[PDB]
Design a protein around this ligand. Structure first.
Ligand SMILES: [Cl-]
Ligand SMILES: [Fe+3]
Ligand SMILES: [Mg+2]
Lengths: 212, 197
């Protein structure tokens, strides 16, 4: 999903609000902030109602202006609430009744997702790969800065996991794939407009192809 | 135009979500309180610092941590949620590593702690992938234009920690002494461990 959440490379932001080893305060800065994570885990591990991937996607599905003005932990309150309503566990009415006011949710999904690709390749360390030149309107774990770009394999995972573009839509055809640490030169991603050296993206097998 | 939707106070909405689920018997007794405790007390950058100080003093462990991070971490009992598949990345005199999640906030929770606000900021998420040298500089860490900077974007299940270089002036320190100078920021990769004068 080419949403506003795909922030890497966007220009115009100011200073990161931190200097090294400055005080970051307690883990939770308000008394409700442990709830979104804890309730996500109840949803995933106790109710079985959704995957973690579905949480990521439902946050991606926040109305874009809504995403941009919402603090981090609140986004996951909104996300988890949205998934509870979508899966038929809760209603929006009961949420707004309990809250005493409006509880707008993430927007409905505009894609049914896609299956784990049938044709993929097992890549080796040192091999050159290109990120597939594909556009996915649903959930994908590929930030757009690397789409179509070439890099080298640094690592093939020794485990495998469900393809996000399926499981993030609660599909039954996510299969399993390893992921690959793909190293890109900074200039491959950003031309001359970078001060860095390399960027390593952890990319599912089904996002990659051999590089010409 | 472009105005926020009306919303109830966020605390009210968060507690409503809790009460709606809990009133349906969908939340076990003590469940959220348990998780709060785990997040505040168990998941901690002190664990990652323990690992670094071990690696610094035990060439065999350092090798294990760098080849099979998961196994190394399992020896201490520190695997957990958002830290099941671990890769440690090694700074050298010509390479400085830095971790982000550009798409959200993904972090090796059990051994780094939950991410701090700044790491989840749009500013970090947008900027460090393209101008990590400037970002680190602004944060108080100078990396010479010679040293390669390598940004790891945490886009799947691998969960990373940085193994920083050991600084001079620490020779013969105990594992407790070394642990003390490895901070959360050192594990993320934005800071280099500091020896007092
Ligand atoms: Cl392929
Ligand atoms: Fe994340
Ligand atoms: Mg985009």
């Amino acid at each position: 999903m080419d949403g506003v959440h795909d922030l890497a490379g966007v220009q115009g932001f100011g200073k990161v609000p931190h200097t090294v080893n400055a005080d970051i305060g307690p883990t939770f800065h308000a008394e409700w902030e442990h709830l979104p994570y804890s309730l996500m885990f109840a949803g995933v591990a106790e109710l079985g109602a959704f995957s973690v991937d579905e949480v990521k996607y439902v946050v991606e599905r926040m109305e874009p202006r809504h995403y941009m003005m919402t603090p981090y932990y609140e986004r996951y309150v909104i996300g988890v609430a949205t998934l509870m309503v979508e899966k038929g566990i809760l209603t929006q009415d009961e949420l707004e009744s309990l809250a005493g006011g409006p509880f707008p949710l993430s927007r409905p999904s505009e894609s049914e997702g896609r299956p784990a690709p049938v044709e993929t390749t097992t890549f080796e360390v040192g091999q050159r790969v290109r990120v597939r030149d594909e556009y996915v309107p649903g959930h994908i774990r590929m930030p757009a800065y690397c789409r179509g770009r070439v890099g080298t394999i640094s690592h093939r995972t020794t485990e495998k996991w469900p393809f996000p573009d399926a499981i993030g839509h609660g599909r039954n055809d996510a299969g399993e794939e390893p992921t690959y640490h793909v190293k890109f030169a900074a200039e491959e991603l950003f031309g001359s407009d970078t001060d860095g050296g390399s960027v390593v993206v952890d990319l599912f097998e089904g996002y990659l192809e051999p590089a010409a | 135009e472009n105005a926020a939707p009306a919303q109830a106070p966020v605390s009210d909405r968060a507690w409503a979500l809790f009460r709606a689920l809990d009133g349906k018997g969908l939340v076990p007794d003590g469940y959220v309180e348990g998780w709060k405790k785990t997040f505040e007390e168990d998941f901690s950058p002190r664990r990652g610092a323990e690992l670094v100080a071990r690696a610094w003093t035990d060439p065999e462990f350092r090798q294990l941590l760098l080849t099979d991070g998961t196994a190394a971490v399992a020896q201490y009992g520190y695997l957990g949620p958002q830290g099941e598949y671990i890769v440690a990345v090694e700074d050298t005199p010509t390479l400085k590593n830095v971790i982000v999640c550009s798409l959200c906030s993904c972090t090796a929770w059990p051994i780094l702690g939950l991410p701090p606000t700044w790491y989840k900021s749009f500013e970090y998420r947008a900027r460090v992938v393209r101008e990590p040298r400037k970002v680190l500089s602004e944060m108080g860490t100078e990396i010479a234009s010679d040293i390669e900077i390598r940004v790891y974007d945490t886009t799947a299940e691998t969960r990373y920690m940085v193994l920083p270089q050991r600084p001079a002036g620490t020779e013969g320190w105990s594992q407790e002494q070394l642990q003390e100078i490895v901070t959360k920021d050192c594990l993320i990769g934005v800071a280099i461990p500091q020896v007092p004068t």
